[PDB]
PDB file of C-alpha atoms (C1' of nucleotides) in Angstrom:
ATOM      1  CA  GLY A   1       0.000   0.000   0.000  1.00 30.49           C
ATOM      2  CA  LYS A   2       1.109   3.508   0.878  1.00 30.85           C
ATOM      3  CA  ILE A   3       4.468   4.179   2.532  1.00 31.12           C
ATOM      4  CA  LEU A   4       5.464   6.658   5.225  1.00 28.80           C
ATOM      5  CA  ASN A   5       5.616  10.351   4.350  1.00 30.00           C
ATOM      6  CA  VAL A   6       9.211  10.887   5.463  1.00 30.62           C
ATOM      7  CA  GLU A   7       8.837  14.675   5.224  1.00 29.23           C
ATOM      8  CA  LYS A   8       6.180  14.516   7.958  1.00 30.13           C
ATOM      9  CA  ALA A   9       7.470  11.406   9.745  1.00 27.48           C
ATOM     10  CA  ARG A  10      10.243  11.615  12.319  1.00 22.45           C
ATOM     11  CA  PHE A  11      13.520   9.841  11.579  1.00 21.16           C
ATOM     12  CA  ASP A  12      12.812   7.390  14.410  1.00 21.05           C
ATOM     13  CA  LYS A  13       9.523   6.462  12.698  1.00 22.67           C
ATOM     14  CA  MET A  14      11.512   5.294   9.637  1.00 24.86           C
ATOM     15  CA  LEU A  15      11.826   1.843  11.280  1.00 26.58           C
ATOM     16  CA  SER A  16       8.820   0.366   9.467  1.00 26.69           C
ATOM     17  CA  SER A  17       8.464  -2.852   7.495  1.00 27.22           C
ATOM     18  CA  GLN A  18       8.112  -1.312   4.023  1.00 29.17           C
ATOM     19  CA  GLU A  19      10.977   1.164   4.381  1.00 28.34           C
ATOM     20  CA  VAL A  20      13.178  -1.432   6.094  1.00 25.78           C
ATOM     21  CA  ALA A  21      12.531  -3.860   3.227  1.00 27.06           C
ATOM     22  CA  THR A  22      13.366  -1.238   0.590  1.00 25.31           C
ATOM     23  CA  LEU A  23      16.528  -0.183   2.429  1.00 29.43           C
ATOM     24  CA  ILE A  24      17.648  -3.809   2.760  1.00 28.82           C
ATOM     25  CA  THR A  25      17.061  -4.464  -0.948  1.00 29.77           C
ATOM     26  CA  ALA A  26      18.911  -1.305  -1.990  1.00 30.26           C
ATOM     27  CA  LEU A  27      21.616  -2.064   0.623  1.00 31.19           C
ATOM     28  CA  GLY A  28      22.449   1.548   1.441  1.00 28.30           C
ATOM     29  CA  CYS A  29      22.641   0.521   5.164  1.00 30.99           C
ATOM     30  CA  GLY A  30      19.371   2.351   5.935  1.00 31.00           C
ATOM     31  CA  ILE A  31      20.865   5.403   7.691  1.00 31.64           C
ATOM     32  CA  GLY A  32      21.183   8.908   6.287  1.00 32.37           C
ATOM     33  CA  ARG A  33      24.897   9.629   6.855  1.00 34.80           C
ATOM     34  CA  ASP A  34      26.287   7.350   9.606  1.00 34.36           C
ATOM     35  CA  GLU A  35      27.135   4.534   7.159  1.00 37.00           C
ATOM     36  CA  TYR A  36      25.383   5.633   3.953  1.00 37.25           C
ATOM     37  CA  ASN A  37      27.434   4.047   1.144  1.00 38.54           C
ATOM     38  CA  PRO A  38      25.741   4.570  -2.253  1.00 40.78           C
ATOM     39  CA  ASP A  39      28.640   2.828  -4.035  1.00 39.93           C
ATOM     40  CA  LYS A  40      27.311  -0.542  -2.753  1.00 44.22           C
ATOM     41  CA  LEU A  41      23.918  -0.152  -4.450  1.00 46.42           C
ATOM     42  CA  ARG A  42      22.672  -3.573  -5.549  1.00 48.14           C
ATOM     43  CA  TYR A  43      20.723  -2.272  -8.590  1.00 48.91           C
ATOM     44  CA  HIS A  44      21.724   0.631 -10.833  1.00 49.84           C
ATOM     45  CA  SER A  45      18.142   0.856 -12.208  1.00 50.50           C
ATOM     46  CA  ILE A  46      15.411   1.397  -9.597  1.00 51.15           C
ATOM     47  CA  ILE A  47      12.033   1.450 -11.349  1.00 51.34           C
ATOM     48  CA  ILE A  48       8.898   2.831  -9.673  1.00 49.18           C
ATOM     49  CA  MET A  49       6.196   0.768 -11.423  1.00 48.25           C
ATOM     50  CA  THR A  50       3.114   1.710  -9.413  1.00 50.45           C
ATOM     51  CA  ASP A  51      -0.487   1.380 -10.587  1.00 51.19           C
ATOM     52  CA  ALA A  52      -1.768   3.397 -13.547  1.00 52.00           C
ATOM     53  CA  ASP A  53      -4.356   5.332 -11.476  1.00 52.42           C
ATOM     54  CA  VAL A  54      -4.489   8.267  -9.050  1.00 50.93           C
ATOM     55  CA  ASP A  55      -3.401   6.424  -5.904  1.00 47.71           C
ATOM     56  CA  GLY A  56      -0.516   5.005  -7.910  1.00 46.15           C
ATOM     57  CA  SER A  57       0.514   8.599  -8.596  1.00 42.41           C
ATOM     58  CA  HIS A  58       0.314   9.397  -4.878  1.00 40.73           C
ATOM     59  CA  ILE A  59       2.446   6.374  -3.973  1.00 39.20           C
ATOM     60  CA  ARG A  60       4.907   7.424  -6.688  1.00 37.15           C
ATOM     61  CA  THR A  61       5.165  10.873  -5.090  1.00 36.59           C
ATOM     62  CA  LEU A  62       5.777   9.295  -1.678  1.00 39.85           C
ATOM     63  CA  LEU A  63       8.504   7.044  -3.109  1.00 41.07           C
ATOM     64  CA  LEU A  64      10.140  10.001  -4.869  1.00 39.02           C
ATOM     65  CA  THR A  65      10.115  11.918  -1.582  1.00 36.30           C
ATOM     66  CA  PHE A  66      11.791   8.956   0.117  1.00 37.27           C
ATOM     67  CA  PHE A  67      14.478   8.663  -2.560  1.00 37.79           C
ATOM     68  CA  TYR A  68      15.198  12.396  -2.696  1.00 37.44           C
ATOM     69  CA  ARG A  69      15.256  13.041   1.057  1.00 35.73           C
ATOM     70  CA  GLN A  70      16.922   9.754   2.082  1.00 36.73           C
ATOM     71  CA  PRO A  71      19.773  11.901  -2.743  1.00 38.66           C
ATOM     72  CA  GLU A  72      22.937  10.801  -4.547  1.00 39.53           C
ATOM     73  CA  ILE A  73      20.963   7.854  -5.952  1.00 39.71           C
ATOM     74  CA  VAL A  74      18.622  10.342  -7.635  1.00 42.39           C
ATOM     75  CA  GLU A  75      21.494  12.584  -8.752  1.00 41.71           C
ATOM     76  CA  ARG A  76      23.452   9.729 -10.354  1.00 38.75           C
ATOM     77  CA  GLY A  77      20.392   8.820 -12.449  1.00 39.29           C
ATOM     78  CA  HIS A  78      19.608   5.364 -11.041  1.00 39.83           C
ATOM     79  CA  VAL A  79      15.884   6.114 -10.443  1.00 40.10           C
ATOM     80  CA  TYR A  80      13.365   5.416 -13.225  1.00 39.57           C
ATOM     81  CA  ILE A  81       9.584   5.680 -13.635  1.00 37.55           C
ATOM     82  CA  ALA A  82       7.547   3.074 -15.513  1.00 41.05           C
ATOM     83  CA  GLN A  83       4.394   4.052 -17.415  1.00 40.54           C
ATOM     84  CA  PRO A  84       1.958   1.126 -17.520  1.00 39.34           C
ATOM     85  CA  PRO A  85      -1.296   1.702 -19.419  1.00 39.98           C
ATOM     86  CA  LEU A  86      -4.599   2.513 -17.738  1.00 39.19           C
ATOM     87  CA  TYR A  87      -6.968   1.563 -20.589  1.00 41.65           C
ATOM     88  CA  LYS A  88      -7.178  -1.133 -23.240  1.00 37.93           C
TER      89      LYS A  88
ATOM     90  C1'  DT B   1     -35.906   9.812  73.523  1.00 34.81           C
ATOM     91  C1'  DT B   2     -31.355   8.240  74.623  1.00 34.18           C
ATOM     92  C1'  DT B   3     -28.180   4.740  74.532  1.00 31.95           C
ATOM     93  C1'  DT B   4     -25.856  -0.039  73.206  1.00 33.55           C
ATOM     94  C1'  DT B   5     -24.085  -4.198  69.890  1.00 35.00           C
ATOM     95  C1'  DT B   6     -22.370  -5.682  65.478  1.00 35.47           C
ATOM     96  C1'  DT B   7     -20.932  -5.417  60.388  1.00 37.43           C
ATOM     97  C1'  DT B   8     -17.846  -4.077  56.614  1.00 36.30           C
ATOM     98  C1'  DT B   9     -14.446  -1.034  53.544  1.00 39.15           C
ATOM     99  C1'  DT B  10     -11.363   1.972  54.206  1.00 38.16           C
ATOM    100  C1'  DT B  11      -6.576   4.924  56.722  1.00 38.12           C
ATOM    101  C1'  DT B  12      -4.334   1.178  54.308  1.00 42.23           C
ATOM    102  C1'  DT B  13       1.734  -0.417  54.198  1.00 41.01           C
ATOM    103  C1'  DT B  14       4.431  -4.812  54.058  1.00 39.09           C
ATOM    104  C1'  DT B  15       5.266  -9.855  52.285  1.00 36.32           C
ATOM    105  C1'  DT B  16       4.957 -12.873  48.430  1.00 35.23           C
ATOM    106  C1'  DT B  17       4.736 -13.654  43.725  1.00 37.78           C
ATOM    107  C1'  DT B  18       4.795 -12.356  38.986  1.00 37.23           C
ATOM    108  C1'  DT B  19       6.253  -9.739  35.050  1.00 38.13           C
ATOM    109  C1'  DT B  20       9.719  -7.239  32.335  1.00 40.04           C
ATOM    110  C1'  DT B  21      14.536  -5.470  31.269  1.00 37.43           C
ATOM    111  C1'  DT B  22      19.102  -7.719  30.894  1.00 37.24           C
ATOM    112  C1'  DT B  23      23.742  -9.721  28.755  1.00 34.68           C
ATOM    113  C1'  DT B  24      27.794 -15.527  28.690  1.00 35.70           C
ATOM    114  C1'  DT B  25      28.165 -19.374  25.760  1.00 32.99           C
ATOM    115  C1'  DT B  26      28.021 -22.666  21.329  1.00 33.10           C
ATOM    116  C1'  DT B  27      26.254 -22.334  16.620  1.00 31.42           C
ATOM    117  C1'  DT B  28      26.134 -19.311  12.000  1.00 31.83           C
ATOM    118  C1'  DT B  29      28.102 -16.580   8.483  1.00 30.94           C
ATOM    119  C1'  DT B  30      31.457 -13.453   5.250  1.00 33.68           C
ATOM    120  C1'  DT B  31      36.303 -12.987   4.379  1.00 33.37           C
ATOM    121  C1'  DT B  32      41.060 -14.449   2.817  1.00 30.50           C
ATOM    122  C1'  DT B  33      43.897 -18.178   1.815  1.00 30.11           C
ATOM    123  C1'  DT B  34      45.216 -22.370  -0.204  1.00 31.97           C
ATOM    124  C1'  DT B  35      43.973 -26.853  -3.538  1.00 33.27           C
ATOM    125  C1'  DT B  36      42.219 -27.943  -8.548  1.00 36.89           C
ATOM    126  C1'  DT B  37      41.709 -27.546 -14.094  1.00 35.02           C
ATOM    127  C1'  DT B  38      42.567 -25.676 -19.075  1.00 32.03           C
ATOM    128  C1'  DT B  39      45.418 -23.347 -22.819  1.00 32.30           C
ATOM    129  C1'  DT B  40      50.766 -21.567 -25.478  1.00 33.32           C
ATOM    130  C1'  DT B  41      54.895 -22.729 -26.679  1.00 35.01           C
ATOM    131  C1'  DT B  42      58.944 -23.922 -25.513  1.00 32.74           C
ATOM    132  C1'  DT B  43      63.447 -25.639 -25.319  1.00 33.51           C
ATOM    133  C1'  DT B  44      63.378 -29.685 -24.060  1.00 32.67           C
ATOM    134  C1'  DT B  45      62.344 -34.460 -23.575  1.00 32.84           C
ATOM    135  C1'  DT B  46      61.524 -38.614 -25.554  1.00 34.26           C
ATOM    136  C1'  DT B  47      60.168 -42.736 -29.453  1.00 37.59           C
ATOM    137  C1'  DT B  48      62.277 -45.476 -33.074  1.00 39.01           C
ATOM    138  C1'  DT B  49      66.270 -47.779 -36.986  1.00 36.45           C
ATOM    139  C1'  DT B  50      71.493 -49.421 -37.503  1.00 38.67           C
ATOM    140  C1'  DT B  51      76.370 -50.778 -35.461  1.00 40.15           C
ATOM    141  C1'  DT B  52      79.044 -52.363 -31.846  1.00 36.57           C
ATOM    142  C1'  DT B  53      82.065 -54.782 -27.920  1.00 37.35           C
ATOM    143  C1'  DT B  54      80.406 -56.676 -23.928  1.00 33.98           C
ATOM    144  C1'  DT B  55      79.414 -59.895 -19.479  1.00 34.87           C
ATOM    145  C1'  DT B  56      76.296 -63.326 -17.682  1.00 32.75           C
ATOM    146  C1'  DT B  57      74.204 -68.236 -18.650  1.00 35.42           C
ATOM    147  C1'  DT B  58      74.781 -72.580 -19.762  1.00 33.24           C
ATOM    148  C1'  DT B  59      78.549 -77.944 -21.142  1.00 35.70           C
ATOM    149  C1'  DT B  60      80.658 -80.378 -16.355  1.00 33.11           C
ATOM    150  C1'  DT B  61      81.974 -81.399 -11.263  1.00 32.55           C
ATOM    151  C1'  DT B  62      82.381 -80.196  -5.890  1.00 34.86           C
ATOM    152  C1'  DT B  63      80.563 -79.789  -1.046  1.00 34.78           C
ATOM    153  C1'  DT B  64      77.913 -78.022   3.362  1.00 38.24           C
ATOM    154  C1'  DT B  65      74.480 -75.765   5.778  1.00 37.96           C
ATOM    155  C1'  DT B  66      70.069 -75.265   5.074  1.00 40.87           C
ATOM    156  C1'  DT B  67      66.707 -79.265   4.381  1.00 38.57           C
ATOM    157  C1'  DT B  68      65.715 -83.695   6.580  1.00 36.19           C
ATOM    158  C1'  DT B  69      63.754 -85.293  11.162  1.00 35.67           C
ATOM    159  C1'  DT B  70      60.858 -86.754  16.233  1.00 36.41           C
ATOM    160  C1'  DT B  71      59.155 -85.154  20.119  1.00 36.14           C
ATOM    161  C1'  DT B  72      57.885 -81.902  24.892  1.00 35.61           C
ATOM    162  C1'  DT B  73      55.288 -78.584  26.277  1.00 35.77           C
ATOM    163  C1'  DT B  74      54.079 -74.643  25.856  1.00 40.57           C
ATOM    164  C1'  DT B  75      49.886 -70.918  24.326  1.00 41.75           C
ATOM    165  C1'  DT B  76      47.495 -69.374  20.854  1.00 40.53           C
ATOM    166  C1'  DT B  77      43.088 -71.005  19.556  1.00 41.68           C
ATOM    167  C1'  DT B  78      38.365 -72.085  20.396  1.00 38.96           C
ATOM    168  C1'  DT B  79      34.145 -72.257  23.296  1.00 39.83           C
ATOM    169  C1'  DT B  80      30.606 -70.057  26.380  1.00 41.58           C
ATOM    170  C1'  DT B  81      28.818 -66.054  28.244  1.00 40.17           C
ATOM    171  C1'  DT B  82      27.706 -61.262  28.497  1.00 39.31           C
ATOM    172  C1'  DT B  83      27.993 -56.165  27.058  1.00 39.85           C
ATOM    173  C1'  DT B  84      28.005 -52.430  23.185  1.00 39.86           C
ATOM    174  C1'  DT B  85      27.121 -51.038  19.072  1.00 39.89           C
ATOM    175  C1'  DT B  86      24.696 -51.229  14.615  1.00 40.40           C
ATOM    176  C1'  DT B  87      20.612 -51.651  12.000  1.00 39.93           C
ATOM    177  C1'  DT B  88      15.698 -52.164  10.867  1.00 40.67           C
ATOM    178  C1'  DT B  89       9.951 -52.732  12.225  1.00 41.39           C
ATOM    179  C1'  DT B  90       6.927 -49.872  14.633  1.00 40.25           C
ATOM    180  C1'  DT B  91       4.895 -45.760  16.239  1.00 41.53           C
ATOM    181  C1'  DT B  92       4.095 -40.891  16.415  1.00 42.01           C
ATOM    182  C1'  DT B  93       3.796 -36.337  14.521  1.00 43.35           C
ATOM    183  C1'  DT B  94       3.417 -32.889  10.857  1.00 46.33           C
ATOM    184  C1'  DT B  95       2.280 -31.071   6.047  1.00 47.27           C
ATOM    185  C1'  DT B  96      -0.459 -30.624   1.723  1.00 49.55           C
ATOM    186  C1'  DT B  97      -4.633 -31.106  -0.970  1.00 48.77           C
ATOM    187  C1'  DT B  98     -10.184 -28.281  -1.452  1.00 49.58           C
ATOM    188  C1'  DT B  99     -14.623 -26.275   0.486  1.00 47.64           C
ATOM    189  C1'  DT B 100     -16.191 -24.387   5.109  1.00 50.48           C
ATOM    190  C1'  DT B 101     -16.167 -21.522  10.165  1.00 49.70           C
ATOM    191  C1'  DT B 102     -13.883 -17.423  12.205  1.00 47.84           C
ATOM    192  C1'  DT B 103     -10.974 -13.247  12.481  1.00 49.70           C
ATOM    193  C1'  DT B 104      -6.303  -9.398  12.450  1.00 49.27           C
ATOM    194  C1'  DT B 105      -3.243  -5.263  10.619  1.00 48.38           C
ATOM    195  C1'  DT B 106       0.195  -0.782   8.122  1.00 44.75           C
ATOM    196  C1'  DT B 107      -0.101   3.844   5.847  1.00 45.35           C
ATOM    197  C1'  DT B 108      -2.311   9.236   3.456  1.00 44.43           C
ATOM    198  C1'  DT B 109      -5.052  13.579   4.081  1.00 43.34           C
ATOM    199  C1'  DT B 110      -6.847  18.014   7.884  1.00 41.27           C
ATOM    200  C1'  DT B 111      -8.120  19.858  12.180  1.00 43.16           C
ATOM    201  C1'  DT B 112      -8.699  19.778  17.078  1.00 41.53           C
ATOM    202  C1'  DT B 113      -7.675  18.071  21.522  1.00 46.53           C
ATOM    203  C1'  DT B 114      -4.627  15.830  25.331  1.00 46.00           C
ATOM    204  C1'  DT B 115       0.064  14.876  27.203  1.00 44.30           C
ATOM    205  C1'  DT B 116       4.956  15.407  27.766  1.00 49.58           C
ATOM    206  C1'  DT B 117       9.420  18.359  27.707  1.00 50.27           C
ATOM    207  C1'  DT B 118      11.952  23.190  27.647  1.00 50.50           C
TER     208       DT B 118
END
DNA sequence: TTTTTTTTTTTTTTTTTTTTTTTTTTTTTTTTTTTTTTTTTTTTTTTTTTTTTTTTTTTTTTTTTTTTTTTTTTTTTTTTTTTTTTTTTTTTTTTTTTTTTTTTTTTTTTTTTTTTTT
């Protein structure tokens, strides 16, 4: 479903199942600067393939907020956005 | 109209037990370090004809010390019994299949109130 709004959520609230799972899969160590090592990223293409509807757009915005606030991954160009169709 | 007996929940705070936060020891897990296998080519090793002077086997005979030999008495071998380990029937438990009965959670968004810290 929806993920935490890290802009509104405290840094201590980041310890949640969805964010912990994403941080483990990316393997950035899950901390902002204490041991943040973007060179050990496990995938150089991170693709945000959410649903093709409005709530998919909201979840995409939340994920983009997470990636930008928690930034070198976005700057290096490893983040992508998929565009699945809504109608057939 | 005054006065007398009894009953319990509270002033309770302390003893016992329970619950909840802790951190020593044997079992996992990622790292470096040492055993394996396939190519190039490379001087180098190694397979196969010819000649040759060698040095060990086969005519013949000799002996002596290992091969004959018999016998006493040991002592390894075999017998019975019992314990320890291995291995396989037996039993128990758990998991999956497909229709049924039940439930339980995490986040956005705004606005207002409690509820702690400074």
